[PDB]
Amino acid sequence: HLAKYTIKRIFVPLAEDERVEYEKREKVYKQFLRARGITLRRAEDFNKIVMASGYDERAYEALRAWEEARRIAFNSKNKIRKLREILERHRKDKIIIFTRHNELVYRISKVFLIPAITHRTSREEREEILEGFRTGRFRAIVSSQVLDEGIDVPDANVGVIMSGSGSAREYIQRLGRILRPSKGKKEAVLYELISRG
């Protein structure tokens, strides 16, 4: 019986060289949106359509733009610098990092020696990792795939959600259901890094 679950949404701005690049992409995108008379409050709802309407260089290069932006934000030098702190502040707990961005997963697992689980890895490899997790070896893991569906996942204490440019409402709840109150204290904390600034 948990007794102190607590969420924290951290807003990490972008790097110098980063804002510049990000902005130039989003420029091309927003132009496409207005050029097609679409409000941005409905992007991606729109991209969903752009996708089902076949190919159009025009429209697609815009989606390719939306890509880089999303990308940049996710891998912000700061996102890492920040993650670092979290990993340190919570070196005494079991952490579960999540990100819908495959690349980041690797960037992380390689920058901080954290075992990873993506839509590759394996089936036993995966498991293997989870057993190591629940028995020491390593106190954290980064994973691109969902961890509740089927997967058992050890009792984790802190969860981190490396978002790109927006808040992952769903994911937050999903993860928070998976976490487990600590031994003593029986608390839990969930972070969600979001580029912004």
Q: What is the resolution of this structure in A?
A: 2.9
* Tokens standing for residue 108: 């992380």
Instruction: Show Cβ contacts of residue 87 under 8 Å, excluding neighbours closer than 6 positions.
Output: 95, 112, 140
Q: At what angle do helices 57-74 and 102-111 cross, to 10 degrees?
A: 30
How buried is residue 104: exposed, middle or buried, by Cβ count under 10 Å (0-12/13-18/19+)? buried
Cβ–Cβ < 8 Å for 45, 66: no
HEC sequence for 25-37: HHHHHHHHHHHCC
Nearest Cα to 160, choosing from 102, 84, 107, 76? 84
Kindly write down the DSSP assignment for every residue of the chain, as one continuous string.
--SEEEEEEEEEE--HHHHHHHHHHHHHHHHHHHHTT--GGGTTHHHHHHHHT---HHHHHHHHHHHHHHHHHHT-HHHHHHHHHHHHHTTTS-EEEE-S-HHHHHHHHHHS---EE-SSS-SHHHHHHHHHHTTSS-SEEEESS-SSSS-------EEEEE-SSS--HHHHHHHHHH----SSTTEEEEEEEEEE-
Please state, in angstroms and rounded to a whole number, the distance separating the CA atoms of residues 75 and 104.
6
The fold for domain 14-75 equals: Helix Hairpins (6.10.140)
Domain ranges within the chain, ordered by starting residue: 1-13+76-197, 14-75
Which CATH architecture fits 1-13+76-197? 3-Layer(aba) Sandwich (3.40)
Nearest Cα to 67, choosing from 47, 38, 39? 47
